[PDB]
RNA sequence: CGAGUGGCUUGCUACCUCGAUGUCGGUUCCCUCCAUCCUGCCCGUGCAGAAGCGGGCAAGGGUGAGGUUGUUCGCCUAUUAAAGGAGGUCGUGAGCUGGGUUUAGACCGUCGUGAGACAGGUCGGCUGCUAUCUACUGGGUGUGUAGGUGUCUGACAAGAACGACCGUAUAGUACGAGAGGAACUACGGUUGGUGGCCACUGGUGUACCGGUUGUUCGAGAGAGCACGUGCCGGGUAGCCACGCCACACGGGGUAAGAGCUGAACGCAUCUAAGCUCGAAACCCACUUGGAAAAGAGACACCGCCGAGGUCCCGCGUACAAGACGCGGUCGAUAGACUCGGGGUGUGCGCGUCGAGGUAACGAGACGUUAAGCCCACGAGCACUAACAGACCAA
RNA sequence: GGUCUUAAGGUAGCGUAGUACCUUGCCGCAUCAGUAGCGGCUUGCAUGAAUGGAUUAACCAGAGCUUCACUGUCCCAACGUUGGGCCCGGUGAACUGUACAUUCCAGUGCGGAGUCUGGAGACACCCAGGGGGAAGCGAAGACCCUAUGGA
RNA sequence: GCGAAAGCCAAGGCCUGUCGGGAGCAACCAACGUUAGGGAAUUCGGCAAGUUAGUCCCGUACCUUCGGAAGAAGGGAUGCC
RNA sequence: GUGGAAGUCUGUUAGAGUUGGUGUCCUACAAUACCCUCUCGUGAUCUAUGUGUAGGGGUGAAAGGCCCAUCGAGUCCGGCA
C-alpha cells in the first residue's frame, strides 16, 4: 500500500544557500498605527539563562504563580541613526530618492563607510518635501549602525549597518520625527522603541554547519535494519523516478546547512535593563561578561554567540501585550557544570 | 530547596525529583549525585559532599 | 483533554508491559493503544503520564487475563517537567484500570500517583493513597 | 434496455526491443490525478435534537500502528477526524533487500517402460562497474552591465508553514414526552508538520580525574601495553533530542450554494445586463531566494594619483579547495602567567591506628588534605607573536 | 452393486502430511489480533508397509514455531574512535568514445527522442556530491521460437 | 593459567605487511565504542548485534535404547591482608 | 575405590574443514582473497614424499564430482580452408 507521509523538510526556506549578509534584512515592517517611531533595533547575542516569572497570562489557571522561563541574553547598547533615507513611489516599485546625513559620526564608522565630508542636508530635505508635496513620497527609513566597541565580549569594532523603517502618524509628522532623530546624532536606545512585555520579531543568520547530509539537513531517515549494513547508511533511496528523467530540486540532497537568515516570529521581551544582573558565573561560555544595556528574550534566538540579531515589533502577534512582567529571579549560576 | 543528597542548595529551575516505590521523595540537584546514589553510596561518606562536610 | 499542567516525554509504546497499580486482580498490563493519538509513518504509538490507553491483561487472575480494558497511566520512569522547571520521575511504569466513566475498576490504588493525574481523572485521584 | 468515459484488471493483436530496456513483493525518496475516505463551504432528507443517510463545490493538508502470509490482494486487532483510490517503464536493483517466480543438488505426490515431466508441494542455492555527457543539490572563478564603499529596490521564484483533534465555559441549556442532547463565540491543551536553539533534562564526550585486574620497568614512587579507552565509576566545553523556543488573524476575488434588483414573457423568475454574500481551495498578507531583470536597476558618500581592493600577519561568529567574517601596536586577535568559573574526589611523603606475628612484616583506617591532578570557557594582563612589507587600482 | 476392467481391490498404521486441488478445511490451544506453529477431526484432488509403514532416546553450522533473558533490529536518531574521503609534493593506469551535444515541457516518429516540430529556458569555466536520464557501461539473450544445427 | 590458550615480557629479529606532507580533519563510506525511556514494535526470519561465561558448593524435570538427558533448570560463593 | 574404555564431550594446541554475516573486496592483495562467526580435532583422522590407474577410459561415501584456472567425455597437433 505504501503509507502516506509528509515530505522531509520545508521547501519554504530555499534555496538553502549561504547568506549574502551576516547582518539580517527584514523584508516586512509593522503597520503605521501609533505615534512616529523607528520600527526596529539591533544587538549582539551573549548566551542563555533562566528566570522565574509571575504567571502573567490572564487566561492561565496558574496566573500569578511562579514559573521558570528560558531566556536569551542579548547585549543591546545604543545605536545611531546616521541618516534619513527617502523612497518615492514609481511604476516599478519604491526607489531611493535621497538621504539626509549628519556630521557627528562615531569614531570608527569609517571602518565600513566612506564617511561624508561634504553633504547638503537641506537640499536633500527640500527634495524630499517637494516629493511629498507632489505625493510621490514612499515610506521613510533611517540608515542605522551599531557600536560593537561598546560591547567588549564582541571582537569587532567595525560597525554593522542596516536600514530600519520609520512608521508614524502622518507622513509629514514622522518625516519631521525622522529628521529630528538624525540631526541630533541619531543616538537611540532599546527603551525608545521597545518596552518589556512586548512581542518582537527577531531575525538573524543561524549558526553555520557547513555541508551536511540529507539526514541532518532535511531530516530524511537513515537506512534501517539490514539496509544499514550494506554500504548505505545516510543516503536516500533514490533521486527520483524513471520519468521525468531528471532530478527534481524538491528531492533532499546534501549541501550548505546553517548560516541562513531566519526571522523568528513573536518573541516576548521579558526585560530590558542595564548592568550585570543577567551575567553568569565564570562568564558566558565562548562569549564573556555582560555589564551594560541588555535585553532578555524569551526562548531562543537564531545565530551563535556574538552574532548580530535584529528586533522589530511583531508584525503578526497572536496575543495582546502584557507589559513589564514581574521578574522574581534571574539565574547567575555558571553555565559550566 | 536543598539537595536531599549532597546538601548544597539546588538552583531554582534546576534538578530532578525521584519518587520512590513506597512514595518517598528525593530531590537531586544534579546527575552526579543521582548517579553516586544509584551506586549505593551514602553522601556522608563522600568528602566533597556538604553533608559529609 | 484538560492541560496536564506539566510537559511529558512519553516513556511508553504500543506493546510495552507496565504495572497495574490497583487491586483489580490484574498484575501486568500490555499497552495496545493510546486514546486520541494518531502517529506518523514508522513511528510507534507513544504514551505517557496522564494518557488514557487501551490495554490487555498479561498477568493476573485467570478471569482478568486476556481481557482488553481501558486504563490511565499513573507513573513512568521517564522524567516530566513541572512549571517550575524541575523534573520528576518514578520508580516504575504503572497504570490503573478504569471504566467508561473513568472510575477506577478497583477499590484501592497501590503506590504513589503524580499530582498532574488529578487535573484529569478525579475519581482516580480521590482514590489515591499518596499523591506526589 | 439504451448511450458513454477511463486506460487500474483481464483478454486480444504481434507494431517496438532477442550483438539483453535486470523479475514479483517490499523498502526509501520525489512529483502528480480526482472518480473525495477525513478536514472547509453547501443542498436534500423518510431533516425535532443528537447520531446518520444521500448529493454539490473542493486535491490545501492528512490518510497512521500492528497479528498470519514472500505475497499484491485480503483476513483480523486496537487506536483514529479519517485510517480514500490511482499514475509516474505495474516510478524507484549504475539505491537497498532477495522472502517468491525461474538454473545446476535433493525429497514427496501424480504421470511415464524409461531418460524424465508437472501452470503441484518442499529444503538449499551469487546481486558486477573508478560518472564522459546530461540533471539537480550546494560551493567557487571569470566575463557582461561600465572606479569604489555602504545601503536598498523587486521583475520574478519557493512554502503547508501550517494541517487536525480533545477539553472548559456556552450548557445539562436550545430541541425533546422522555431517553438523550447541540451551536455561535471565547478559552486551555494535544498531535502531525516546519524553522531555530542548548539556560533546563537527557545522550556523547578513546579532553579530563579516580578505582582496579594481568604484566614489564627490582620494590616504592611514577609509568607502558592489554585496538586503536584493559575494564569499571564520574564527567567540562561542544555537538545534539528524548530537551526548550517560535509558526495568525484579517482583507480581496470566486466555486457549490443562499439571495437582491430585473427583463425577454405587463405576471413570475438569483441571471440574460447589474448587484449582495459565500469554501481548509485562489490572490494578498507572512517567511526564504532574488541586479545576469540584456529595459543587466536605485540612493548616499568617497575617489580618478589615488578611493578602495588583493597578497601578508594573529585568528574565527566561517569553512572539504575556493569563499566568508574579525583583529593587526591609534591593539586584547592568539599564546604564556595569574585570577574567576568548572571536572574529579582527598595526592607524594610523614605521623598515629591496625587483625596479628618473637621479629621481619602487615591489607587497610585517620590526620596533614574541599587535598592532589585536570580544563576545548571567562577576566585581568602588551610579557611573546599580530613584524617586515609587496601589489593592483579609473 | 447387496460383480466389471486387468491379477488383486488398501490390511497394521499414519493422515489437510516436505504427500491435501478445493484451503486461510472445521474445532481447540496461543495472541489485542496468528494464511504461521501445535493438538484433535479427517470422505486421503492424488497416504501405506524393505518403491518399506509406524514410531523413536541420543546426535545436528538441517526446516517451522513458542517462552524467559538480552539488546540501537525498530520507535529515532546522537555523539565519539581509527582508516579513507578533502588540500599539497611525488608516482600514475583502466573502462569508455559515429558525430554533434546548456537543456526542459509537450508533440511527432518503427508505437520508449539531448539532436525532428512547437514552445519554454539557457552568459562561460571550475570544485564537491548523491547516482534521475543517456531505454548508461559490461556479455552477438541463458527464457521463447526457427535450423532437413550439436551433444 | 588447566593449558603448546589470552594478555604482558625476554633472547633473537624487525620499523620493508615500504610513498609522504596538511586541515578539529565537513558531507559520505569502512571498521568500531557509548547511547535515555521503551524492549523484536524491526524483518521472510532476531539477519546483525547483544546476553551468558572461568572455578567451587548446593540442586536438577519430561523423556530414555538405562548409555543418556545434564554444565538441564535454579540458588549461593569467588579479592586482598 | 581402582581402572581408563570411546568413529565420546569441551577446546582458534597443532592441524583439517567451511555455516552465517548474503559484511570487506568485486578494472581485487587474489581468474575463488580478507575479517568476524562457525564445524572437526584418537580417527571411516590430518599430512609429506614416493608410487599405481589415462580419455568413451580412470577415479568417484554419487555432486555428472574430479583427471594441472580445461569435464554430460582432458589437453595438444592433425583431418581442416
Ligand atoms: Cl532502509
Ligand atoms: Cl495503536
Ligand atoms: Mg549486500
Ligand atoms: Mg554548561
Ligand atoms: Mg548542573
Ligand atoms: Mg513500516
Ligand atoms: Mg537500464
Ligand atoms: Mg468533483
Ligand atoms: Mg497536491
Ligand atoms: Mg516498476
Ligand atoms: Mg508507487
Ligand atoms: Mg544492479
Ligand atoms: Mg535505477
Ligand atoms: Mg556502482
Ligand atoms: Mg531466494
Ligand atoms: Mg523460502
Ligand atoms: Mg526456496
Ligand atoms: Mg557577450
Ligand atoms: Mg591504549
Ligand atoms: Mg493441523
Ligand atoms: Mg543473439
Ligand atoms: Mg531450453
Ligand atoms: Mg543429436
Ligand atoms: Mg537504549
Ligand atoms: Mg513483527
Ligand atoms: Mg512490520
Ligand atoms: Mg547470530
Ligand atoms: Mg570426537
Ligand atoms: Mg573440539
Ligand atoms: Mg600420493
Ligand atoms: Mg543432476
Ligand atoms: Mg595446460
Ligand atoms: Na558494510
Ligand atoms: Na558495499
Ligand atoms: Na531503472
Ligand atoms: Na539491442
Ligand atoms: Na521492487
Ligand atoms: Na486535497
Ligand atoms: Na497484513
Ligand atoms: Na522497466
Ligand atoms: Na541488485
Ligand atoms: Na526490486
Ligand atoms: Na474569501
Ligand atoms: Na548589474
Ligand atoms: Na502405493
Ligand atoms: Na556432522
Ligand atoms: Na550502534
Ligand atoms: Na545518473
Ligand atoms: Na619507503
Ligand atoms: Na568400577
Ligand atoms: Na568462512
Ligand atoms: Na574423449
Ligand atoms: Na583442425
Q: How far apart are CA A204 and CA A182, in angstroms?
A: 26
CATH 3.30.1430.10 spans which residues of chain A?
Answer: 78-188
Q: Chain B residue with minimal CA distance to A69?
A: B13
CATH 4.10.960.10 spans which residues of chain A?
Answer: 1-38+207-257
Spatial CA neighbour of C94 closest among C72, C78, C116, C79 = C72
Question: In sequence order, what are the residues at sequence separation of 6 or more whose Cβ sits closer than 8 angstroms to the Cβ of residue B27?
Answer: B1, B2, B3, B4, B10, B15, B16, B17, B18, C86
Give the one of C86, C91, C114 whose C-beta lies nearest to B15's C-beta. C86
The number of C-alpha atoms within 13 Å of A6 and in the hemisphere containing its C-beta is: 8
Distance from CA of B14 to the nearest CA of A (A): 9
| Beta-carbon separation of C84 and B15 below 8 A | no
Experimentally, the structure was elucidated by X-ray
- Which of strand G's nucleotides are less than 7 A from any protein C-beta? 21-25
Question: In sequence order, what are the residues at sequence separation of 6 or more whose Cβ sits closer than 8 angstroms to the Cβ of residue C19?
Answer: C27, C28, C29, C92, C93, C94, C95
- Which of strand E's nucleotides are less than 7 A from any protein C-beta? 31-33, 73-79, 103-106, 112, 114, 128-134
- Terminal CA-to-CA distance of chain A, rounded, Å? 51
Distances (CA, A) of A127 to A86, A88, A102: 10, 11, 17
Q: What is the 3-state composition of chain C as percent helix, strand, coil, each rounded to the nearest 5? A: 5, 40, 55
Distances (CA, A) of A256 to A16, A19, A247, A250, A303: 7, 10, 19, 16, 15
Pair C101, C19: CB distance under 8 Å: no
User: Residues 3-42, chain B: which have Cβ within 8 Å of C?
Assistant: 12-23, 25, 27
Pair A273, A290: CB distance under 8 Å: no
Q: Which three cell numbers stand for residue A66?
A: 511562579
Q: How far apart are CA A290 and CA A74, in angstroms?
A: 9
CA trace torsion C126, C14, A222, A262 (10° rounding): -30
Q: How far apart are CA A137 and CA A142, in angstroms?
A: 15
Spatial CA neighbour of A25 closest among A137, A150, A158, A165 = A165
Query: Position of cell 549525585?
Result: B33
Residues of C in contact with B23 (CB under 8 A): 111-112, 129-130, 132
Instruction: Confirm or reject contact between B45 and chain C (CB < 8 A).
Output: no
Nearest-nucleotide field for A298 (CA, C1'): D245
Question: What size, in residues, is chain B?
Answer: 53
Q: How far apart are CA B6 and CA B34, in angstroms?
A: 10
Question: In sequence order, what are the residues at sequence separation of 6 or more whose Cβ sits closer than 8 angstroms to the Cβ of residue A219?
Answer: A8, A9
Residues of B in contact with C112 (CB under 8 A): 19, 22-23
Residues of C in contact with A5 (CB under 8 A): 40-41
Distance A236 CA to ligand 14 centre (A): 15
* B&C contacts, CB < 8 Å: 43
Please give the CATH superfamily to which domain A1-38+207-257 belongs.
Answer: Ribosomal protein L3, domain 3 (4.10.960.10)
Spatial CA neighbour of A153 closest among A1, A290, A316 = A290
Q: How far apart are CA A168 and CA A93, in angstroms?
A: 21
Instruction: Confirm or reject contact between C42 and chain A (CB < 8 A).
Output: yes
Pair C81, A50: CB distance under 8 Å: no
B39 annotated ligand binder: no
Q: Long-range pairs for A105-114 at CB < 8 Å and ≥24 separation?
A: A106/A80, A106/A145, A106/A147, A106/A159, A107/A149, A108/A149, A108/A157, A108/A158, A108/A159, A109/A82, A109/A145, A109/A159, A111/A157, A111/A158, A111/A159, A112/A145, A112/A158, A112/A159, A112/A160, A112/A161, A113/A161
B13 annotated ligand binder: no
| Beta-carbon separation of A65 and C40 below 8 A | no
Q: How far apart are CA B28 and CA B16, in angstroms?
A: 5
B42 annotated ligand binder: no
In this complex, the answer to whether residue B30 has its CB under 7 A from any atom of chain D, a nucleic strand, is yes
**Domains of chain C, CATH where assigned:** 1-132 (2.40.150.20)
Q: How far is the CA of A245 from the C1' of E123 (A)?
A: 26
Nearest-nucleotide field for A231 (CA, C1'): F29
Question: In sequence order, what are the residues at sequence separation of 6 or more whose Cβ sits closer than 8 angstroms to the Cβ of residue A71?
Answer: A48, A49, A50, A51, A270, A296, A297, A298, A299
Q: How far is the CA of C6 from the C1' of E85 (A)?
A: 47
Architecture per CATH, A78-188? 2-Layer Sandwich (3.30)
Residues of A in contact with B13 (CB under 8 A): 50, 52, 68, 329, 331
Please give the CATH superfamily to which domain A39-77+189-206+258-337 belongs.
Answer: Translation factors (2.40.30.10)
Q: Which residue is nearest to nucleotide D378 (CA to C1')?
A: A283
Number of H helices, E strands in chain A: 3, 15
B33 annotated ligand binder: yes
Q: How far is the CA of C23 from the C1' of F77 (A)?
A: 39
Nearest-nucleotide field for A30 (CA, C1'): D286
Residues near chain E (nucleic strand), Cβ < 7 A? A 215-216, 221-222, 224-225, 228, 232, 235-236, 238-247, 253-254; C 13-15, 30, 32, 40, 42-44, 46, 56, 58, 66, 68
The yes/no answer on whether domain B1-53 falls in CATH 1.10.3470.10 is: no
Amino acid at each position: 500500500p505504501q503509507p502516506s507521509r509528509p515530505r522531509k523538510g520545508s521547501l519554504g526556506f530555499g534555496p538553502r544557500k549561504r547568506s549574502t549578509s551576516e547582518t539580517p534584512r527584514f523584508n516586512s515592517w509593522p503597520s503605521d498605527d501609533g505615534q512616529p517611531g523607528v520600527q526596529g533595533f539591533a544587538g549582539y547575542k551573549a548566551g542563555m539563562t533562566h528566570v522565574v516569572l509571575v504567571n502573567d497570562e490572564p487566561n492561565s489557571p496558574r496566573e500569578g504563580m511562579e514559573e521558570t522561563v528560558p531566556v536569551t541574553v542579548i547585549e543591546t547598547p545604543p545605536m545611531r541613526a546616521v541618516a534619513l533615507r527617502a523612497y518615492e513611489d514609481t511604476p516599478y516599485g519604491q526607489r531611493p530618492l535621497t538621504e539626509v546625513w549628519t556630521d557627528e559620526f562615531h569614531s570608527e564608522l569609517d571602518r565600513t563607510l566612506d564617511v561624508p565630508e561634504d553633504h547638503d542636508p537641506d537640499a536633500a530635505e527640500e527634495q524630499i518635501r517637494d516629493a511629498h508635496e507632489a505625493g510621490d513620497l514612499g515610506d521613510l527609513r533611517l540608515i542605522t549602525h551599531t557600536v560593537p566597541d561598546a560591547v567588549p565580549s564582541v571582537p569587532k569594532k567595525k560597525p554593522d549597518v542596516m536600514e530600519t523603517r520609520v512608521g508614524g502618524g502622518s507622513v509629514s509628522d514622522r518625516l519631521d520625527h525622522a529628521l529630528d532623530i538624525v540631526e541630533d546624532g541619531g543616538e537611540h536606545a532599546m527603551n525608545d522603541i521597545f518596552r518589556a512585555g512586548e512581542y518582537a520579531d527577531v531575525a538573524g543568520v543561524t549558526k553555520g554547519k557547513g555541508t551536511q547530509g540529507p539526514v541532518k539537513r532535511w531530516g530524511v531517515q537513515k537506512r534501517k535494519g539490514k539496509h544499514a549494513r550494506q554500504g548505505w547508511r545516510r543516503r536516500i533511496g533514490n533521486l527520483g523516478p524513471w520519468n521525468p528523467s531528471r532530478v527534481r530540486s524538491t528531492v533532499p540532497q546534501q549541501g550548505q546547512t546553517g548560516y541562513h537568515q531566519r526571522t523568528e516570529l513573536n518573541k516576548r521581551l521579558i526585560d530590558i535593563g542595564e548592568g550585570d544582573e543577567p551575567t553568569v558565573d565564570g562568564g558566558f561560555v565562548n562569549y564573556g561578561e555582560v555589564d551594560g544595556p541588555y535585553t532578555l528574550v524569551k526562548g531562543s534566538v537564531p545565530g551563535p554567540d556574538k552574532r548580530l540579531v535584529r528586533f522589530r515589533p511583531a508584525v503578526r502577534p497572536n496575543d495582546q501585550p502584557r507589559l513589564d512582567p514581574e521578574v522574581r529571579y534571574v539565574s547567575n549560576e555558571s553555565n559550566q557544570g | 530547596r536543598e539537595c536531599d543528597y549532597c546538601g548544597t542548595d539546588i538552583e531554582p529551575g534546576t534538578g530532578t525529583m525521584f519518587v520512590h516505590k513506597d512514595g518517598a521523595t528525593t530531590h537531586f540537584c544534579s546527575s552526579k549525585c543521582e548517579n553516586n546514589a544509584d551506586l549505593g553510596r551514602e553522601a556522608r561518606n563522600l568528602e566533597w559532599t556538604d553533608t559529609a562536610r | 483533554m484538560e492541560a496536564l499542567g506539566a510537559d511529558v516525554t512519553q516513556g511508553l509504546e504500543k506493546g510495552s508491559l507496565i504495572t497495574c497499580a490497583d487491586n483489580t486482580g490484574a498484575r501486568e498490563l500490555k499497552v495496545i493503544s493510546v486514546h486520541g493519538y494518531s502517529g506518523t509513518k514508522n513511528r510507534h504509538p507513544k504514551a505517557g503520564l496522564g494518557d488514557k490507553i487501551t490495554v490487555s491483561v498479561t498477568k493476573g487472575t485467570p478471569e482478568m487475563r486476556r481481557q482488553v480494558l481501558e486504563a490511565v497511566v499513573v507513573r513512568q520512569r521517564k522524567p516530566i517537567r513541572r512549571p517550575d522547571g524541575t523534573r520528576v520521575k518514578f520508580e516504575d511504569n504503572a497504570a490503573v484500570i478504569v471504566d467508561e466513566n473513568e472510575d477506577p475498576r478497583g477499590t484501592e490504588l497501590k503506590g504513589p500517583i503524580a499530582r498532574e493525574v488529578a487535573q484529569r481523572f478525579g475519581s482516580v485521584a480521590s482514590a489515591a493513597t499518596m499523591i506526589v
